[PDB]
């Protein structure tokens, strides 16, 4: 069945680091995610000072959209190059500090603390004691995790959530035989299976996402879907 075509495909931490060194970062959206933009006011309606977590954040420009609006932002990214590029691109000063609980890892914080980006693996993050969050934006994250690590990833995400929460996750649907991930194919049913017990799920959107750079992979279709998950 389609959903397990990719079951044993992996990209390692070192592979990701190398994509950044060599500049293979086609996943970055220079003008930021359009569905988040459309849904942002609602994601944030009537609250101020939320804690927002960005798994596998790369240099996502939407982190600056939350910090700008008075919210605290935490991200995790294996690549120091991506982390430093975010700060240079967003024109913010930052400090760098080692994390003792995680060997070789460190945290980069904007000068006034609004944005903290942990340079480590998401699987190691729990040892960094980062607290819990009201909000999670997940794009190019759950879809970049190796299929084999889905259950581990999902338990991390769930342990990072406060009792009341909004969790926006963006997934891609395409034919898994015609492209070896990332981005991996994460169907609705996989989402339901990982979070369905702890979260109510609502599909907010589903736009056609196919473009020339995708016909190149051999893709004849590509749909982007945005799910909102909240408490039960
Ligand atoms: N286990 C892991 N822990 C932390 N970062 C990881 C990771 N696996 C992959 N990454 C990083 O996660 C990113 C996924 S690509 C998408 C980046 C970002 N969310 C965006 O929308 O642009 C890459 O930057 C990769 O360096
Ligand atoms: S993003 C978001 N958050 C909460 N409720 C919603 N309804 C539609 N979009 C929503
Ligand atoms: S995470 C990721 N990696 C590569 N390409 C992508 N497109 C959308 N998300 C992506």
Curated annotation (Swiss-Prot):
Gene3D superfamilies: Vaccinia Virus protein VP39 (3.40.50.150). SUPFAM superfamilies: S-adenosyl-L-methionine-dependent methyltransferases. It is an enzyme of class 2 (transferase). It catalyses: S-adenosyl-L-methionine + a thiopurine = S-adenosyl-L-homocysteine + a thiopurine S-methylether; mercaptopurine + S-adenosyl-L-methionine = 6-methylthiopurine + S-adenosyl-L-homocysteine + H(+). Its main location: cytoplasm. GO terms for cellular component: cytoplasm. The keyword S-adenosyl-L-methionine applies. The modification N6-acetyllysine is found at residue 45. GO terms for molecular function: thiopurine S-methyltransferase activity. The keyword Transmembrane helix does not apply. The modification Phosphoserine is found at residue 26. GO terms for biological process: methylation. S-adenosyl-L-methionine binds at residues 16-27, 56, 77, 121-122, 139. Monomer. Catalyzes the S-methylation of thiopurine drugs such as 6-mercaptopurine (also called mercaptopurine, 6-MP or its brand name Purinethol) using S-adenosyl-L-methionine as the methyl donor. TPMT activity modulates the cytotoxic effects of thiopurine prodrugs. A natural substrate for this enzyme has yet to be identified. This is Thiopurine S-methyltransferase. It comes from Mus musculus (Mouse). The lineage of its organism: Eukaryota, Metazoa, Chordata, Craniata, Vertebrata.
């Amino acid at each position: 069945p389609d959903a397990e075509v990719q079951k044993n495909q992996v990209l390692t931490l070192e592979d990701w680091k190398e994509k950044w060194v060599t500049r293979h970062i086609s996943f970055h959206q220079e003008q930021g995610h359009q569905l988040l933009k459309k849904h942002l006011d609602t994601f944030l309606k009537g609250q101020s000072g939320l804690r927002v977590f960005f798994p596998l954040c790369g240099k996502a420009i939407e982190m600056k959209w939350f910090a700008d609006r008075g919210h605290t932002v935490v991200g995790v990214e294996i690549s120091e190059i991506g982390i430093r590029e975010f700060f240079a691109e967003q024109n913010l000063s930052y400090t760098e500090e080692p994390l003792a609980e995680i060997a070789g890892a460190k945290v980069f914080k904007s000068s006034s603390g609004s944005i903290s980006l942990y340079c480590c693996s998401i699987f190691d993050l729990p040892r960094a004691n980062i607290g819990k969050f009201d909000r999670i934006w997940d794009r190019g994250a759950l879809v970049a995790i190796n299929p084999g690590d889905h259950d581990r990833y999902a338990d991390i995400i769930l342990s990072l959530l406060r009792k009341e929460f909004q969790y926006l996750v963006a997934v891609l649907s395409y034919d898994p035989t015609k492209h070896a991930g990332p981005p991996f194919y994460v169907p609705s049913a996989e989402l339901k299976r990982l979070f369905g017990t702890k979260c109510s799920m609502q599909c907010l959107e589903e736009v056609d996402a196919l473009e020339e750079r995708h016909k190149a992979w051999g893709l004849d279709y590509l749909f982007e879907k945005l799910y909102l998950l909240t408490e039960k």
